[PDB]
Amino acid sequence: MIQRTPKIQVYSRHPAENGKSNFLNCYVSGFHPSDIEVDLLKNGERIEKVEHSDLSFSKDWSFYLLYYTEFTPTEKDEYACRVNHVTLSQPKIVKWDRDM
Amino acid sequence: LSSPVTKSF
Amino acid sequence: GSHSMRYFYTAMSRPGRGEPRFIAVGYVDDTQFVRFDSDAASPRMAPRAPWIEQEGPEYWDGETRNMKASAQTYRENLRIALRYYNQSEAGSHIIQVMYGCDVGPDGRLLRGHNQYAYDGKDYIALNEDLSSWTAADTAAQITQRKWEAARVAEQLRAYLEGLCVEWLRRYLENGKETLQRADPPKTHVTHHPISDHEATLRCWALGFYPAEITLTWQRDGEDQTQDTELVETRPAGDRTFQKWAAVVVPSGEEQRYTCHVQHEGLPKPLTLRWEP
Q: Kindly report each contact of residues A90-96 with a partner whose C-beta sits within 8 Å and lies 24 or more positions away, as own/partner.
A: A91/A37, A92/A6, A92/A8, A93/A41, A94/A8, A94/A9, A94/A10, A94/A26, A95/A10, A96/A10, A96/A11, A96/A12, A96/A24
C99 Cβ contact partners less than 8 Å away, ≥ 6 residues apart: B3, C6, C7, C112, C113, C114, C115, C156, C160
DSSP A77: -
User: Which of A55, A86, A87, A97 to mutate to test binding with chain C, by most C CBs within 10 Å of its CB?
Assistant: A55
CA distance linking residue C195 with residue C199, whole number of Å: 7
Contact of C66 with B4, CB cutoff 8 Å: yes
C27 at B interface, C-beta within 8 A: no
CA angle at A66 for the pair A92 and C73, rounded to the nearest 5°:
105
The CATH number of the domain where A58 resides is what?
Answer: 2.60.40.10
C150 reaches B (C-beta below 8 A): yes
Which H helix or E strand runs over A64?
strand A63-71
CB A38 within 8 A of CB A20: no
Burial of residue C236, with CB atoms counted within 10 A of its CB: 0-12 exposed, 13-18 middle, 19 or more buried: buried
Q: Which amino acid is at C239?
A: R
Residues of chain C with C-beta less than 8 angstroms from the C-beta of B4: 66, 155, 159
Cβ pair C25:A9 closer than 8 A? no
φ, ψ of residue C221 to 5 degrees: the values are 80, 10
Which residue of chain C has the CA closest to A31? C120
Q: What domains are there in chain C, each with its CATH number?
A: 1-181 (3.30.500.10), 182-272 (2.60.40.10)
How determined? X-ray
For the beta carbon of residue A80, count every other beta carbon within 10 angstroms: 18
Calculate the alpha carbon distances from C249 to A26, C136, C227 in Å. Answer: 29, 45, 10
List chains touching B (3+ CB pairs under 8 A). Answer: C
Which residue type does C213 have? I
CB C217 within 8 A of CB C245: yes
In the 8-state DSSP scheme, what is residue A4?
Answer: B
> How many CB atoms lie under 10 A from the CB of residue A50?
16
Interface test with A, best of C21, C39, C98, C240 (most A CBs within 10 A): C98
The total of structural domains in chain A comes to 1
Nearest to C92 by CA among C206, C11, C205: C11
Task: Please say whether the beta carbons of C80 and B8 come within 8 A.
Answer: yes
Determine whether C247 is exposed, middle or buried from the number of CB atoms within 10 Å of its CB (0-12, 13-18, 19+): buried
Longest pairwise C-alpha distance within chain C: 70
CA A37 vs CA A83, C5, C181: distances in Å = 6, 30, 35
CA–CA dist C239, C43 (Å, integer): 25
CA distance A32 to chain C (A): 7
Among chain C residues, the shortest Cα distance to B1 is held by C167
Nearest CA in chain B to C73: B8
C40: Cβ contacts below 8 Å, ≥ 6 apart: none
Asked if residue C99 lies in contact with residue C165, where contact means CB atoms within 8 angstroms, the answer is no
Question: By residue range, what is the domain housing residue A7?
Answer: 1-100
Cα–Cα nearest to C250, from C191, C184, C171: C191
Query: In sequence order, what are the residues at sequence separation of 6 or more whose Cβ sits closer than 8 angstroms to the Cβ of residue C184?
Result: C208, C263, C265, C266
Written in H, E and C, the secondary structure of chain C is CCEEEEEEEEEECCCCCCCCEEEEEEEECCEEEEEEECCCCCCCCEECCHHHCCCCHHHHHHHHHHHHHHHHHHHHHHHHHHHHCCCCCCCCCEEEEEEEEEECCCCCEEEEEEEEEECCEEEEEECCCCCCEEECCHHHHHHHHHHHHCCHHHHHHHHHHCHHHHHHHHHHHHCHHHHCCCECCEEEEEEEECCCCEEEEEEEEEEEECCCCEEEEEECCEECHHHCEECCCEECCCCCEEEEEEEEEECCCHHHEEEEEECCCCCCCEEECCCC
Chain B residues with CB inside 8 Å of C146's CB? 7, 9
Q: How far is C63 from chain B (nearest CA, A)?
A: 7
CA distance C139 to C85: 7
Preceding peptide of C105 cis, ω within 30°: no
Measured between beta carbons, the chain A residues lying within 8 angstroms of C27 are 56
Interface test with B, best of C32, C64, C159, C166 (most B CBs within 10 A): C159
Q: Which amino acid is at A70?
A: E
* Cβ <8 Å between A99 and C202: yes
Neighbours of C215 (CB within 10 A): 24
Number of residues that this document lists for chain C: 276
Q: To 10 degrees, what angle do helices C138-149 and C152-161 make?
A: 80
Q: Work out whether the CA dihedral C177, C178, C182, C184 comes out positive or negative.
A: positive
Nearest CA-CA partner of C236 in A28, A83, A27, A73? A27
Q: Rounded to whole angstroms, what are the CA distances from A36 to A64, C60, C228?
A: 10, 30, 30
Q: What sign does the CA torsion over C248, C252, C254, C256 have?
A: negative
What is the 8-class DSSP label of residue A75? Answer: S
- Distance to chain C for A44, nearest Cα, Å: 23
Q: How far does CA C127 lie from the centroid of its chain?
A: 19
